[PDB]
Design a protein around this nucleic acid. Sequence first.
RNA 1: GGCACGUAGCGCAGCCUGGUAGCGCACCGUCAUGGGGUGUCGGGGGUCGGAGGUUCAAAUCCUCUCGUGCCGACCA
RNA 2: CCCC
RNA 3: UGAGCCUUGAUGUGUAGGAUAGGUGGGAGGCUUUGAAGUGUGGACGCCAGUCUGCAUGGAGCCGACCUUGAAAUACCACC
Lengths: 114, 134
Amino acid sequence: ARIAGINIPDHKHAVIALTSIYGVGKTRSKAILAAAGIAEDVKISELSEGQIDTLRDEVAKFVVEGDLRREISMSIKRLMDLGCYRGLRHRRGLPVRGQRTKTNARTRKGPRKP
Amino acid sequence: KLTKRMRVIREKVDATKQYDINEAIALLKELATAKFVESVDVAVNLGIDARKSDQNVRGATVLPHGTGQVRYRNDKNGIIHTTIGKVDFDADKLKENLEALLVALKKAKPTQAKGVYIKKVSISTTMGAGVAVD
RNA sequence: GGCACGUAGCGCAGCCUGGUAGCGCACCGUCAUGGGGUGUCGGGGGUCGGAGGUUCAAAUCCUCUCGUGCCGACCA
RNA sequence: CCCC
RNA sequence: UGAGCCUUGAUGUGUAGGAUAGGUGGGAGGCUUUGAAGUGUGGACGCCAGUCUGCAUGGAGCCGACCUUGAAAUACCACC
Ligand SMILES: [Mg+2]
């Protein structure tokens, strides 16, 4: 409801909230609840802050949204300065999850212009 | 269609006979038929075409006896609604009030008037049949 | 002065009869074919000639102007 | 509707 | 047989939102037995959604303000 200062994953299980968090998904939610000592069957609107601050600290160890995109941009700067084939593919503004682009890359290459 | 209230008031007047100012304050006693201080509305039917932005009115008139500084603005079709007071506000003094109102409108006469400035003055009652004077 | 037209590239409704630019053609790409046409299907294409006001809103109200037209007037 |  | 015109009849789904509400525009008492609200129906319109009125029974109660609405009531009155 208040972890990260910005996100309000209200009405979400102790782990569903962490999965809905920006920065981490399925596994780090469980890792956090395990390293902090909480169950994963109750929403966040029942837990007091004496534990929410601990969850906040426990998540403050990995990269966060404010630094997630920064690390991503750093990798992108590395690519663009290297000029590698991947850097060129990225600088041409094309979809990004893999290798194949010719006839099925429409998902992030958008629809057809002509 | 109605009760003994509205029919007598509407037959105590005449729509085709445009009364004068002096006789205008002669029947408001019978036209005032509310158990309070009922007002009397006034309408100035004007003789211009207000469809142009050039022909708007705006001002404030001083009531010579109060109701006293009342604002006014014209209409788009040429019928401006204003008021003078109530029916028991010394009917004889209602004519004196009317006198001070129209003298400020003839003075406030805009310059872009096309055709006749004024057409009619309907001194109508709030709970009865109105009257139309020149 | 007096009135009648400007709407995608073309011709048009809407009109220059209020609330929310559409019609056909033209063009592009599929489908219908054994192959085509016609056809559907979908998509680009315009802002209402220009400007200004009335409007909870204009295009569909009012003023002026632009271009093009018919009528009419016009004895430095 | 036309054509092979 | 067109046009004009006094009078009256009568108007005007936007959406919104109690609601076929044209601008204004002043405005709380109209409303009532020269014979209620509820109902009987016929009629007019109808974007038929609702306005709508004849003689009624019912037979004397409803409503403006009240409330969110582009706007307010269409209590009455206002000239179109
Ligand atoms: Mg690509």
